[PDB]
Each structure stands twice: as C-alpha cells, then as structure tokens.
Design a protein around this ligand. Structure first.
Ligand SMILES: c1ccc(C2(N3CCCCC3)CCCCC2)cc1
Lengths: 215, 216
C-alpha cells in the first residue's frame, strides 16, 4: 500500500528553519508527484506546491515561494519541505500528498508545526477518583487530568492500551500558553477500585512518560 | 487564484437522510484538456483529508456508493444518500485546474438524532495537586445531544465563572453525541476556603438541570 510516512511534530522558534519529510513506501517514488499542503489550525486548506521525483520538476504557489523549498531524496524515497523565516502564521498542520498527473492519491498522516519562542514544559498528570459523583456501584467514570504541558502534542492512553472502550479524551485548551487535557474512562464497578486502571500519558517534546492510578 | 465557496458552512442531518454540499467556482474550472478537476475530500476529526470523488463524478476505490458528486463547470454538488454516522467530518472541494490550486472552505456534517441527557460527573482536586499547591475541580458531561448545553459552576451556592475552561470532544461517530469537560481551576488557597462545589448542567434535552456536587 502507498504508505506515506510523513512524520514528526516539532516546535521551532521564529526566524528559524525546519525540514520535514515524507517516506514513500509501497510504490515507485519516481512515478508520482509529491505535493505540499497546509492545513491551518485543523480548518483552512492551502496548496503550497509540488515536486516530481524523477527529474526534480517543481512549482510553487506564489504565496509560499518566499518560504518554501521543496526537494527530494531519490535513493531513500523521501520528499522534504523547508519552511524558513518562521513567524507565528507558520504554525500549522502540513500534509504531504501523492498526485498522478491528473489527481491526488494518498495523503500522509500530517505534521504539526508549532512556531514558538517558548520552552517545552512536561504535563502534570493528576489522577481523578470520585467520592462525590455518579456512584461507583454500576458503571463509574474515572479521569486523568494532564495540565500545564507545552508544546501541544501529548497522547492520553489507558491501561497500557488495555481499555480502549468508553474513553472520552477531550481536546486541550491553553492557559497562559500551557495546554490542559483531560480524558475519562467510564468503567464497570467490578474494575475500579478492584482492578487497576492506569493512565498512560506521553509528551514527545520533553521525553515525558508517566503511568498513573489512584485510591 | 480561483475562489472556491462551499455552502453550507454547517449541515445538520439525521440518519438515513440525504445531504447536499455545494461548491462553486469564481470562474470555470473546466481544463482545456476537456476535463474538470474538482475533488471531494472528507476529513474526519483527528485525521487527514481522504479522497472520495475525483473529476466531479468519479468515486475513489473503496468509497461507499452513497456518495455521488456532480456539477456543471462552475457549480458542483457532493451528494449523500442516507447519511450514516461515520459520515461526520469536514467536506472539501478542490480545484486542480487553474493555479494556484484552491480548496473550498469546508462543510460540517454533524448528525441529528434523539436528544440525550448528559451523564454528569464531578471530581474534587486529586491529592497531589493539593500537596503541590493548586486546585482543579473537574466535571465530565458525557454522551449528550444536542450540542448547546450550558454548565455553570457554583461555589457554596454562588455562581462562578473565571478559572473555568470547557472542552468539547467531537461528535462521536459510533453514537452521534458529544462529551464536554469543565475544569474549575482555583488555587488551593481559595479552595480550602469553601465547602460545596456544584457543576450544574443546563441543556436542551429535558428542560431541567442535572446537578453534581461534593463538599470537602
Ligand atoms: C503537478 C501535477 C498535477 C497537478 C494537478 N492537475 C492535474 C490536471 C492538469 C492540471 C493540474 C492539480 C493539483 C493536484 C494534482 C492534479 C498539479 C501539479
């Protein structure tokens, strides 16, 4: 399968530059154009330009020409976008897409680019038990509070991944430039407290993993 | 640059119903090769846009037959027969005829259904947060519908607002509801100085609150 492994969220101060890539496996990297698209705050979509991996033929949207630089690595099947002169407006989700002469094909997963002059500050994971809400005797709701972490990416998980049903992980809101997440797993009375419910939080930009539980 | 306008911005529909998302071009996007490059993308939340329809009329490999696009050079329409739950997401039309290639604004397909009163949960400050010095009172209003549903935090009866951050989870695709999180954050300092915490839930399902509370 056309597995485009576009990857890595990362933050960069303004003025700086960044180089993101897409791995094309499953096919002939030289046969299809690789395109670059900008998904601005999970909302707006804009086209940056393309690159064709057999001759290096390329083109850009005049609006991204002064900051975008597209290149390819033919021997390792990878395309790269170089974003430079990074002001706040550059922080966004960038997709890499495959296109035949006529149409787009498979888009890559996505790259998050936080343009920030700020530091990386790990999440404070405080576990939540009831004692005051919808009783624990039939089906109970537990929570995990991930607060005060920067930058934006953290994934909340449960029971080593051994509790995927009934979980509501809400998005994050930013307090004074920190992000606060909260998720909740509605489990049976039998499970908590009888059994262990472990909250697994991960935050790349700080190398922070903390597996928690409660009373 | 060719402008792409996607009406409606938001389209609510129930299950088994039909949906029609329009997209129009500031000018013809019929290519000289004699082809119209208008694409239809469906981006599910927490995902990337995937291709549904290419060249107005054609459907991508493995896309269900319920989606059908059509249009005339300047006006296009994506059509859905019997909206299903997994059809939530933002719908996009794209033009790869004139450069630079533009994307239409997008369209929201939330799914209408039967009202559901939220299962409300309240959580006092966990132990570590106190030892550390702050206090966060959390409240999970899960599995509800419709979306407009207010939450007022009241301390010892008195309404409270500043220090509260609410977050909405996207409309679940398996059941068609929402979940919200309200977190009354207040310094342990101002917290120990009180007894009861009320997370009240106003909403449009049954016109009567669901109140959760705790006292320290
Ligand atoms: C390089 C290769 C293909 C294109 C597209 N288009 C194909 C038909 C003819 C006009 C340009 C539009 C953008 C998405 C891919 C298709 C642009 C640039």
């Amino acid at each position: 399968e056309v597995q485009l492994q576009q990857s890595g969220p990362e933050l960069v101060k303004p003025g700086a530059s960044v180089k993101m890539s897409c791995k094309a496996s499953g096919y002939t990297f030289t046969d299809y154009y690789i395109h670059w698209n900008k998904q601005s705050h999970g909302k707006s979509l804009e086209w940056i330009g393309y690159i064709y991996p057999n001759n290096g033929g390329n083109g850009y949207n005049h609006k991204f020409k002064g900051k975008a630089t597209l290149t390819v690595d033919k021997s390792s099947s990878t395309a790269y976008m170089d974003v430079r002169t990074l002001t706040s407006e550059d922080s966004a989700v960038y997709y890499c897409g495959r296109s035949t002469w006529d149409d787009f094909d498979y888009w890559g997963q996505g790259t998050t680019l936080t343009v920030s002059s700020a530091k990386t500050t790990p999440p404070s994971v405080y576990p939540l038990a009831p004692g005051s809400a919808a009783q624990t005797n039939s089906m109970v709701t537990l929570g995990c509070l991930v607060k005060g972490y920067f930058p934006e990416p953290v994934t909340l998980t449960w029971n080593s991944g051994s509790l995927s049903s009934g979980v509501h992980t809400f998005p994050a809101v930013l307090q004074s430039d920190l992000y606060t997440l909260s998720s909740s797993v509605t489990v049976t009375s039998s499970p908590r407290p009888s059994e262990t419910v472990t909250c697994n939080v991960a935050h790349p930009a700080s190398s922070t993993k903390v597996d928690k539980k409660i009373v | 640059d060719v402008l792409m306008t996607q009406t409606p911005l938001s389209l609510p529909v129930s299950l088994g119903d039909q949906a029609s998302i329009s997209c129009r071009s500031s000018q013809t996007i019929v290519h000289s090769n004699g082809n119209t490059y208008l694409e239809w993308y469906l981006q599910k939340p927490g995902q990337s846009p995937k291709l549904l329809i290419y060249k107005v009329t054609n459907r991508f490999s493995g896309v269900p037959d319920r989606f059908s696009g059509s249009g005339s050079g300047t006006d296009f329409t994506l059509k859905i027969s019997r909206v299903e739950a997994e059809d939530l997401g933002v719908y996009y039309c794209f033009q790869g005829t004139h450069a630079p290639y533009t994307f239409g604004g997008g369209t929201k397909l939330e799914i209408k259904r039967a009202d559901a009163a939220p299962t409300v949960s309240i959580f006092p400050p966990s132990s570590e947060q106190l030892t550390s010095g702050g206090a966060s009172v959390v409240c999970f209003l899960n599995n509800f519908y419709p979306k407009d549903i207010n939450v007022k935090w009241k301390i010892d009866g008195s309404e409270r607002q500043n220090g509260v951050l609410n977050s909405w989870t996207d409309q679940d695709s398996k059941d068609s509801t929402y979940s919200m999180s309200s977190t009354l954050t207040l310094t342990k300092d101002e917290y120990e100085r009180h007894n009861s915490y009320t997370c009240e839930a106003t909403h449009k399902t049954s016109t009567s609150p669901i109140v959760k509370s705790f006292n320290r």
